[PDB]
A paper describes a structure:
However, for these theories to be broadly applicable, they need to be demonstrated for large and multimeric enzymes that catalyze complicated reactions. The enzyme used in this study is a type II DNA topoisomerase (Top2) from African swine fever virus (Asfv), a dimeric multi-subdomain enzyme (271 kDa) that catalyzes multistep reactions to modulate DNA topology. AsfvTop2 has been found to be involved in the early stage of viral gene replication, and also detected at the intermediate and late stages of infection. The domain composition of AsfvTop2 resembles that of the canonical Type IIA DNA topoisomerases (Top2), including the well-studied eukaryotic counterparts, which form homodimers. The catalytic process not only involves well-coordinated changes in protein quaternary structures to allow timely opening and closing of the N-, DNA-, and C-gates, but also ATP binding and sequential hydrolysis that relate the dimerization and catalytic activity of the ATPase domain to the mechanistic steps of the cycle.
We first performed the cryo-EM reconstruction of the full-length apo-AsfvTop2 without DNA or nucleotide. Furthermore, these primary conformational states are each sub-classified into two conformers, a and b, exhibiting local differences. The distribution of the three primary co-existing apo-conformers is approximately 1:4:2. Even though such differences are modest energetically, they do suggest that the closed state II is the most stable state, followed by the C-gate open state III and then the open state I. These thermodynamic properties are reflected in their structural properties described in the following sections. Conformers Ia/Ib were aligned globally with two apo-yeast Top2 structures. The results from the preceding section suggest that, even though the global conformation of apo-IIa is very similar to that of EDI-1, binding of DNA/inhibitor still induces small subdomain reorientations, yet coupled with substantial catalytically relevant conformational changes locally. On the other hand, as shown in Fig. 4f, the three ß-HPs and the catalytic Y800 in apo-Ia are farther away, relative to the corresponding moieties in apo-IIa, from the catalytically relevant positions in EDI-1, suggesting that it is less feasible for apo-I to bind the DNA substrate and undergo functionally relevant conformational changes.
Author numbering:
A (entry chain B), B (entry chain A): 716 to 1192
């Protein structure tokens, strides 16, 4: 959607350098290049929604580095500051690990009006469609979904990649029968409460502290995805519950949650005699609206177009994995296909120096008979500036336009390129890149799927960026 | 002075293209590069003073193309418009003919604070110190001088350059004896009046029309360098002359001069009986203040610093000519000195191709023994990027840093540069530039002074630009 359009903005604008840039200036850059026609206000509110960093925000891991204060959990991110004064900084450490730079050249790009457009879907290292809560990037309709923890999806992806996990074939066994033996639990970050499961729904409950010595009721934790100001007004609506409430004063603050509630003890003995004495939970969390109903609404973009609904989050992770798994194979094969062309081009230039002024002379090179005469000389007619600089080209298209290439990679070199020292660096470039070919040849041949070993390293790289961001003051340095 | 600082602004800013630019934007460019620290207001009023185009203006030929209206002859150029709204355009046709581009590399540049500064004086094709009236580029003190016509200085410069003029040695004879037989007269552009000479001063007089049939006095032409509004208030000061003036109403307008004066005929018979009956001129131009005293004030910048005063304008033209004449010799000698170095460099590369893979091989070129081994090979050790790209270097400095040059003009060429077709274009480049050397060698050898023939062509080029500007609507196209 529009989120992916903003994603290409950070990497393209900050390709030269990752410095501090204004939000509106970056927004103007994004619409200038990727043709954002929905207005800068819609772009600016989407940038903040993409870069929101607060408990309860939809985006747990922002694409960009949070600068200044974008709000607080009280209003649920609706108290954003002035876009003009605030600045935006791309998180270069996370974005390259989460989205590999080399994989971007292979991503399926659509073309609109004869120009490239952003991909329909991205296939990152970890699925961004589950790690983030639902939100309202547009107006009117709001998508509602709940994120899973960063320990169950990690165990699931490592089970489908690493062979060392004992439950490797067990996960594969569950794929065919759709039994889903492995667990999968909601996010628990910045929620010191409880989560309880009956039937087919979840409910989040807060924490309250009761002290007999001082007869003061203390509320510790809020529900999972509630703004603070919402609970203030919701408790005032019920006239029946207002009679029991003599007074509620909020003492909670930012980075320090402590609420003092003065409730008469004589009201404690009569609340339970008229609230039917629910046995599922205590009356303290029943009289106080400290619960929310989690109606799982699942939406995933269809590859062919449209929207799909899944009964559980397992069907999303079990569907996101194969598309990422498939493109690991294509990434290595294309890189394999370009290294072998580089060996052909480099060796020809190295061997050209042997048939240069060292031993032989063929300087005449009339453009008419240079075609088939040089054919028996072994010099390949491959086009230059493509092998050294690969582009958004598929494996099938790469071979067609490389074999039927053109000259000027030969006999257009600098006169020093055929000197004795230059050949030594040129010939030694082959073996270093020949050894890299061997490792890739050694890869892409495992029984489960190609590129399994590199997947684990990429998974760890994502974890390194997330840990460093949280360990530091969200500075990544 | 500050005028020459603005001069370099137009050529440098409009080197890429000659388009329409705002006056203040150009002023910011000038101060940014040539370090104008007198303020933009002083710069802006100097730009308009440099680009003023109206009868009576100090600058007859503006450096830039006049855009819009900068005022009128009524206020004498003090009614300039808003600098921000008006635009400035460099007159590329005139400026290159008046100031040769190639001569700029040889002009004496001073260095301040380790950086280049504008030349102390310029030596253009025609002397700008006489063709323009005096003005007040600064505040407080105003320089007063009167320009000569564009037919007497042209006859004088052609007499000192062209041998076909019968009064060639006559001018040279007048130089030693300071007799100045040749004439020299003031400017007569846009002045349909009279100029009269007694003693050692000039006086400009207007034209009046008297009709007996209608008994209406008509004034046709104003004095040479008078604003229209000055004459309105000056005639009101004299109380004695106010009695005779029953009423004066100005009917003159822009591009149409016609003034109706109603004077009673009975006052005509009594003005002459009390004004002493001056015989030098009629009483009509005596009662009406239609004359001005031309006190010749001559100021010329000293080459060593200071100001000089000359008794006549002849001493200025007879002093400006030798400095321009001297630098014609230096311009050709430097261009002669760079063509002969270009022949050495190009022939070596052409002959290098002969000792390239065609016949001989010397590709080893160890950096230690390439010094004296290649010395017997005839390859000159001249530094590249200097002959092909000359800079602000004198003839004496050019030879010192060219003979003691460096390599990389050899054996760093493209491999196609030693191909058979490339040598043909390279060897034929020698003879075309050898023929140009012959003409320069044929020049700089005349008895009067070097570069006499090119001077006449440059003089005509200046005349072509001036004629085209006046023939068209001051558009030069």
């Amino acid at each position: 959607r529009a989120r992916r359009k903003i994603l290409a903005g950070g990497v393209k604008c900050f390709a030269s350098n990752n410095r501090e840039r204004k939000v509106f200036q970056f927004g103007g850059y994004v619409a200038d290049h990727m043709f954002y026609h929905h207005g800068d206000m819609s772009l600016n509110t989407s940038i903040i929604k993409a870069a929101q960093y607060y408990p309860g925000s939809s985006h747990l891991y922002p694409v960009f580095i949070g600068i200044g204060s974008f709000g607080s959990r009280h209003l649920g991110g609706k108290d954003a500051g002035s876009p003009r004064y605030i600045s935006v900084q791309l998180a270069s450490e996370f974005i390259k690990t989460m989205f590999p730079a080399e994989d971007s050249w292979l991503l399926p790009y659509v073309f609109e009006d004869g120009q490239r457009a952003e991909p329909e879907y991205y296939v990152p290292v970890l699925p961004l469609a589950i790690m983030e809560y639902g939100a309202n990037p547009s107006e009117g309709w709001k998508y509602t979904t709940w994120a899973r923890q960063l320990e169950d999806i990690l165990a699931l992806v490592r089970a489908y990649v690493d062979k060392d996990n004992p439950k490797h074939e067990l996960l594969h066994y569950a794929i065919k029968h759709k039994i889903t033996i492995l667990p999968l639990r909601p996010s628990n970050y910045n929620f010191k409460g409880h989560l309880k499961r009956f039937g087919q729904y979840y409910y989040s409950y807060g924490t309250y502290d009761i002290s007999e010595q001082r007869n003061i009721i203390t509320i510790t934790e809020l529900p999972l995805r509630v703004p603070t100001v919402a609970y203030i007004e919701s408790i005032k609506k019920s006239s029946n519950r207002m009679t029991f409430i003599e007074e509620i004063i909020d003492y909670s603050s930012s980075e320090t949650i402590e609420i003092l509630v003065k409730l008469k003890p004589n009201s404690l003995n009569r609340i339970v005699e008229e609230f039917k004495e629910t046995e599922e939970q205590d009356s303290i969390e029943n009289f106080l609206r400290l619960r929310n109903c989690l109606h799982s609404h699942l939406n995933f973009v269809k590859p062919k177009g449209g929207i799909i609904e899944f009964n559980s989050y397992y069907e999303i992770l079990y569907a996101w994995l194969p598309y990422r798994r498939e493109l690991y194979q294509k990434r290595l094969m294309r890189e394999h296909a370009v290294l072998k062309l580089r060996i052909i081009m480099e060796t020809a230039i190295v061997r050209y120096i042997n048939e240069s002024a060292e031993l032989n002379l063929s300087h005449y090179e009339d453009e008419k008979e240079a075609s088939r005469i040089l054919s028996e000389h072994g010099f390949p007619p491959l086009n230059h500036t493509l092998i050294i600089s690969p582009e958004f080209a598929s494996i099938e298209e790469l071979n067609q336009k490389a074999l039927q290439g053109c000259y000027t990679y030969i006999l257009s070199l600098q006169a020093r390129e055929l000197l004795i020292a230059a050949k030594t660096r040129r010939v030694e470039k082959i073996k270093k890149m020949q050894a890299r070919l061997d490792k890739v040849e050694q890869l892409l041949q495992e029984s489960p799927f190609p590129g399994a070993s590199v997947w684990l390293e990429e998974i760890d790289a994502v974890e390194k960026a997330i840990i460093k961001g949280r360990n530091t003051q969200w500075k990544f340095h």
